[PDB]
RNA sequence: UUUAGAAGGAUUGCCGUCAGGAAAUUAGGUGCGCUUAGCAGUGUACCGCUAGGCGG
DNA sequence: TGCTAAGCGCACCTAATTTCCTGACGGCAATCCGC
């Protein structure tokens, strides 16, 4: 109908989640492809149809919430617990469980295919993306709604892009010990949460939180990525996380 | 539980985490120089429960 | 019939602070200049003046106690304190985040707009003002202030200023016509009738010279170092938003022993505040059984227990029913 | 009320400012101030340390280098200049937590009745004759011709004091000035003024280029001499001026034994003469659950101990 | 429709005392900075006769 | 309201050696478990 290119430039998000199980930093890539599908389905709300169907990921600045030690290591903070539901809910001190937090400012690019695609849906994003949140964390101000057009309106940041032939051409073992070698060869690269890998079939079980949808339960699976500047990305479309399923997985790919 | 692009439609996914993972996780990157973060947060206490 | 809790109802924050930056400044040129307020780095020796069993004391009562420490203090020549932060005030229908049965979201969403018609969410927002405007979200840094001054700026509206020590901690106005015009704005956005609200408070707190400035304190579980670890934001000192957030939902007076005990408490499920360690509602006036009786077995409560009710969905949680195996 | 609550805790109302060191000149101190910056001092020694009989052997002619630092005056100075300030605050109004409001009513009661006994009038005295004797100025009061202490609070610089003239083990009780400051901390301290700002100046005029002692700062794991640096010239960690403001206690058990008051603290622990001092029954924990738990009149010494402590702070929580 | 949704970390403190860094020195040699031009742009803007327009 | 255009800014040799780098005492109390 009307593809393009819709930046929400400099977003700063306040205490997000930072833990997928082995990982405390970076979220989730299918927390950031979350906030585009709640935006697309908070503007498909408001008789404004348009299918977000490509995000850009990418980092101005950055901070885990916690300190760092003198060992160089990092220490990573949580709030106080409060009132948990559950057996000891009546108690003073609750307990802690796995938790990280990070702050960031992000600037996402969205690949946007509408009837049209003008300044006005600029406008109903800044009117959408004050009542939304990325990871679990709230935004605090964002800098500008834009339109780009090529990659040269698109601000200094460095993206993530999904690098797995760094990670399938790796020393050997198994898939840890490839991830673990890999790493140590290139130390410009990250671990990052890319999606879920089914443990069941597709079916009812009792306590969803919807119950008219399919369920299955999921780990999670993980891989490498890596971070590029704005200057040296070629023809964009290669920073551009997009929705994939097949027959048991749930992956978020750079096709 | 969260949500997930299905094809037009969505599916609950409820995430359980894996132990075993963790597990070998912890024991490789202490033999290892990648950046780690250790996180002790849960009390033996909440482990055994 | 509605005979339980939805087996998943969640609900999301409606006042939405953010984390705090603490700035040191003058006061005859508070206006203009603003000067980063950094966290040092304080050990301290001291003694063992702890309390310990009979025995140990007297092998350990004369031995030196060497701790670590962080502390926040104003300079030589800046004698006020800058906290700015900024709120996001959301609609209460519209923070239902996940509710499996459809039954349950239609009764409570006739309970709300009950709630907009008889006093539509605005003596809850002009006790959130209030909490705003007496300033309790300075809370050791309330003590020991020559002038208080609080400023509310709404969309770009700056408001006219609040003199805060002129408001007593246990009492809330209702009369102030700028508490009123915060409020109303407030009320209408957690209504429904406006979608989003965004308010900036920055406070000037005038306590002296070189004096002390108390951050928030985070927890850090690490073995090889037990100190105070303060909060650093952006390098500089601040606040967590889940502390300025308990000062603002502390404007609960409708709990069944107000009388003896004649102090706002935060606004929690079972009535537990952390300075007193008794549950204030316990039994028969707790959110989870005046929500049962409100919902399931219909019924007109009191319009205290219905403030308590909807302050607490405006706190937001996990409100589910006992999950079961 | 049976035991103290599982959350109790005080803050203080003595807050003591970081202190900074200045030089100026005697004649000249009314109108002229410079910093004083510290100096690493990296020194050559002999191996004067004791060692065992097999290690002596091998190195007791070995050079010894080690590492430190210094604050000396100019050469154009004599006199040292150490400002800091001082908030009192009401005590009443500082327990941070309570977990039982019974506790609180009974602690309110007792400090009321001590504002009608004595309203903290006696211990605001020894505050003040802590602050007029220069005992703040530890290693920095020896060896010095005049020491004048300049007091100021709101915008009235009050009479000069000739610290000099003040013996550390006896508390005067006939000065003027420090009778009409202490009536001001003791009506901060009852609850009639709600804060008391107060700021201190003092003048050692010790000498031309003669060493100032600053607070050295605490090393923990595997070091040298780190002096304290406030604002980049020298200065007093906070902690030290308010150990040597509370030096008030002549009201332990063995005190007509050792006639010298000793800093506040809770088992009554004094550095200086290693002994404890408050071991046993006239202790703080023993005289909190013998004035409130068991209500009994104690004497007005133990009284004024127990609100001293209860200026100073702490974690008094039972388990 | 985001490992969804929720969360007060708090109170208190004396780091101290002491010290020899020290002895010796070769920086040297060599060298093309050149060519050319309007301080011009009127160079100024005053002396008189409510807002506005005017003798020389 | 202008303030120039042009070329280029070394080749060598090296940068010390001995003795050592403290002794003490100590590093908190509370609370964070579902069944």
């Known amino acids: 109908m009307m593809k393009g290119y819709i930046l929400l430039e400099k977003v700063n ?18 927390s950031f492809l979350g906030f585009a599908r709640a935006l697309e389905r908070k503007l498909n709300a408001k008789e404004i149809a348009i299918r977000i169907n490509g995000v850009g990921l990418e980092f ?57 695609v ?8 800044k009117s959408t993306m004050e009542t939304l949140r990325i990871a679990g964390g709230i935004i605090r101000n964002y800098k500008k709604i834009r339109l780009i057009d090529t990659l040269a309106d698109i601000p200094y940041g460095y993206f993530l892009t999904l690098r797995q032939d760094n990670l399938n051409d790796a020393a050997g073992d198994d898939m840890l010990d490839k991830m673990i070698h890999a790493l140590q060869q290139e130390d410009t690269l990250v671990p990052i949460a890319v999606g879920f890998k089914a443990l069941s079939e597709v079916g009812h079980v009792e306590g969803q939180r919807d119950p008219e949808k399919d369920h299955c339960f999921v780990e999670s699976i993980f891989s490498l990525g890596g971070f590029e500047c704005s200057k040296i990305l070629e023809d964009i479309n290669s920073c551009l996380w997009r929705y994939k399923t097949e027959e048991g997985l749930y992956l978020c790919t750079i096709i | 539980q969260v949500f997930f692009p299905v094809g037009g439609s969505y599916h609950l996914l409820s995430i359980l985490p894996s132990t075993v993972l963790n597990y070998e996780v912890s024991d490789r990157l202490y033999r290892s120089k990648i950046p780690k973060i250790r996180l002790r947060l849960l009390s033996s206490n909440a482990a055994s429960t | 019939t509605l ?29 203009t200049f603003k000067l980063p307020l950094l966290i040092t780095d304080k050990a301290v020796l001291a003694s063992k003046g702890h309390e310990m069993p009979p025995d140990k004391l007297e092998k350990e009562i004369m031995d030196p106690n060497p701790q670590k420490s962080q502390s926040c203090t104003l300079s030589t020549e800046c004698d006020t304190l800058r906290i700015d932060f900024g709120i996001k005030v959301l609609p209460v229908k519209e923070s239902m985040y996940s509710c499996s049965d459809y039954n349950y979201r239609t009764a409570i969403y006739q309970k709300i707009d009950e709630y907009i018609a008889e006093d539509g969410f605005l003596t809850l927002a002009k006790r959130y003002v209030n909490n705003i405007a007496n300033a309790r979200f300075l809370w050791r840094n309330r003590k020991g202030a020559e002038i208080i001054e609080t400023i509310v700026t709404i969309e770009d509206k700056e408001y006219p200023s609040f003199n805060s020590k002129s408001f007593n901690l246990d009492t809330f106005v209702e009369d102030n016509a700028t ?54 934001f952006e390098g500089s000192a601040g606040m967590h938003s889940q502390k300025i957030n308990n000062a603002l939902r502390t404007i609960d007076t409708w709990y069944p022993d107000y009388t003896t005990y004649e102090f706002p408490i935060p606004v929690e499920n079972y009535g537990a505040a952390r300075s007193i360690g008794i549950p204030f509602r316990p039994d028969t006036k707790s959110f989870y059984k005046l929500i049962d009786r409100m919902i399931l077995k219909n019924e007109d409560l009191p319009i205290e227990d219905k403030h308590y009710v909807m302050a607490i969905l405006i706190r937001g949680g996990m409100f589910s029913k006992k999950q079961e195996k």
Not at chain 1, 13 to 30: D, R
Not at chain 1, 102 to 109: A, G, P, Q, V
Not at chain 1, 118 to 125: A, E, G, P, Q, V
């Open chain 1, 13 to 30: 998000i306040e205490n997000a989640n930072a833990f997928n199980n082995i990982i405390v930093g970076i979220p989730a890539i299918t």
């Open chain 1, 60 to 116: 101005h600045e950055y901070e885990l919430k916690g300190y760092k030690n003198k060992r160089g290591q990092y220490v990573t903070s949580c709030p106080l617990p409060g009132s948990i539901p559950g057996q000891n809910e009546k108690k003073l001190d609750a307990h802690i469980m796995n938790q990280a937090y990070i702050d960031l400012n992000m600037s996402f690019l969205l690949e946007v295919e509408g009837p049209h």
């Open chain 1, 118 to 125: 003008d300044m006005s849906t600029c406008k109903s994003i």
């Open chain 3, 3 to 31: 005979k339980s809790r939805p087996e998943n109802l969640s609900f999301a924050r409606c006042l939405n602070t953010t984390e705090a930056k603490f700035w040191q400044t003058d006061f005859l040129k508070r206006h």
């Open chain 3, 179 to 232: 508490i009123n015009e915060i409020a109303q704005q407030i009320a209408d956005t957690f209504a429904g009738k406006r979608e989003y609200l965004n308010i900036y408070v920055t406070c000037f707190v005038k306590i002296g010279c070189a004096m002390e400035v108390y951050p928030s304190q985070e927890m850090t579980f690490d073995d090889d170092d037990k100190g105070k670890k303060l909060f650093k």
